Design a protein around this ligand. Structure first.
Ligand SMILES: O=C1[C@H](c2cccc(Cl)c2)CCN1c1cncc2ccccc12
Ligand SMILES: O=C1[C@H](c2cccc(Cl)c2)CCN1c1cncc2ccccc12
Ligand SMILES: [Cl-]
Ligand SMILES: [Cl-]
Lengths: 305, 300
């Protein structure tokens, strides 16, 4: 019993964190095989950030302008190239702690663990979801750029996020490991804002199934709904549309608890229209949307890595 | 910016998780140097659990009765001893991944990271607090006994908890790494229950200071309170008494935000009375009590 916001064990990722310095700028890098990946804005001064020409700024730099530190061992940069918004520093030594890995680009609603780092050293690990507005509600201070997001699928670390910036509302924006930003964001000091966010419907339903599995049934009712009637109510409350794919993905949880997906939709429809009436679900007064259906099954089954 | 329930990076602890088997019972062990630490109930059958005489059950066991597996490598048990509710298995190989470590016994209200494991393999990491009733609200299934709680302040891992059991309310009970249970609990299948739980007042105040540091001030008010008047009110909402030690511990956060501890206490008194009125504090509709003053300073 119990249901916690649980992150993947971060050990395989910790063995990849390095410190990257370019001039006065110091951030984190991801050392996989003989390449160190980091945000390309490491080559910029604060004036450059106003309107950077990264190709022109990078051509002025040489290998010895990048100082890479793996613990207390300095790695020597033997090449450098840019791929979208990420800088790839070719290093002279392959990381002996390189795990089995892949670079994956996730969709909004998908969750991942973030290993927050400062000066190449990991300080903490937390779970979060890619919001429908392509931001993440992370916890990052100055110096955390280059920190990564990941999932673990068996023995393979799937790197899905690299931290680049904080928007004025305190939410965060970054890229996949190929340097493509999630969202309409750019790596420049200019007016940027997170768009209006929505709730990840399939995740709330998954979390309602976790509450049922944990003995919380007060919100269940005798009712069912059509997918179309539920989607009209979802649009009303700033909830993401629930697709047939989402209904299929919730199938295992529906079979385990004996509550059909559209039966659980009528519970959620009632919660949206009436609130919780002083009650909590899994210790929460809000409907939680940062657990995917797979996260719920993994936690309520003990999948290990 | 942002405030998350953040766990310590678990890498140093993952390199210590091993699987321990005794008969039909399989749980997790903590492999530090040449010793594997695990709950002593690994030597019991379900039938032995009602009234186990661990000393009598252990004397019947030899080293080869304990199978220890570190990944895909079987470790050889060369000795065994019991210290309180923990079994210490002397193994033939020292763990090369043994980090700098210490065993620390924590007080209620303290937080720690839990690396939940099954079959010697880590499955997840989450942040926990030792409840005032000496239980933890964890996420543990059958097979998670031997999973550990820890803090990693300054390269050193301070092991503070080892999971042993789930109480009937779904909350968890365990020991420090010297085998002493937190709370009035025993490693027996007898009727046991968590005492009535309370909110960790000093932690809720610390989290209110984190909200102020992050730009949220809606809950602040022009009032202050005496320490005694605050405790008379807080007691009525099942909050732990706030001591002078707690007020001292909140000093740095009080100086940083410019809000006196007893002024922040008056905000909490008002939140207890009014609720949030549709608002949130750091993305929460409830008052969070699982961040210590130390955690708030670390993160903010
Ligand atoms: O957002 C930025 C800066 C920036 C500026 C323009 C464009 C880019 Cl891509 C990045 C670089 C550091 N940084 C931060 C990143 N995360 C958290 C932070 C918290 C507090 C201050 C800064 C933070
Ligand atoms: O509570 C126990 C059992 C037990 C019984 C009496 C005394 C002791 Cl010390 C231990 C051993 C396993 N175990 C569990 C431990 N954590 C989570 C669990 C979840 C679901 C079922 C069991 C769980
Ligand atoms: Cl450009
Ligand atoms: Cl402040």
């Amino acid at each position: 019993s119990g249901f916690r916001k649980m992150a993947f064990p971060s050990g395989k990722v910790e063995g990849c964190m390095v410190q990257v310095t370019c001039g006065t700028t110091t951030l984190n890098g991801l050392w996989l095989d003989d390449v160190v990946y980091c945000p390309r804005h490491v080559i910029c001064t604060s004036e450059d950030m106003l309107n950077p020409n990264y190709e022109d700024l990078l051509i002025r730099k040489s290998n010895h302008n990048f100082l890479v530190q793996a613990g207390n061992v300095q790695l020597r940069v033997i090449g450098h190239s840019m791929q979208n918004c990420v800088l790839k520093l070719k290093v002279d030594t392959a990381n002996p702690k390189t795990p089995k890995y892949k670079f994956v680009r996730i969709q909004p609603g998908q969750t991942f663990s973030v290993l927050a780092c400062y000066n190449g050293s990991p300080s903490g690990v937390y779970q979060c979801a890619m919001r429908p507005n392509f931001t993440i509600k992370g916890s990052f201070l100055n110096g955390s750029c280059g920190s990564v997001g990941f999932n673990i699928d068996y023995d393979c670390v799937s790197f899905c996020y690299m931290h680049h910036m904080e928007l004025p509302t305190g939410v965060h924006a970054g890229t996949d490991l190929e340097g493509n930003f999630y969202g309409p964001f750019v790596d420049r000091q200019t007016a940027q804002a997170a768009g209006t966010d929505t709730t990840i419907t399939v995740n709330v339903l998954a979390w309602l199934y976790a509450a049922v599995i944990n003995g919380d049934r007060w919100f269940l009712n005798r009712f069912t709904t059509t997918l179309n009637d539920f989607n009209l109510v979802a649009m009303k409350y700033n909830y993401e549309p629930l697709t047939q794919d989402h209904v299929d993905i919730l199938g295992p949880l529906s079979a385990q608890t004996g509550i059909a997906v559209l039966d659980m939709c009528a519970s959620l429809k009632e919660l949206l229209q009436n609130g919780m009436n002083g009650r909590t679900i899994l210790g929460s007064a809000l409907l939680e949307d940062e657990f995917t259906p797979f996260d719920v099954v993994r936690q309520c089954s003990g999948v290990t890595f």
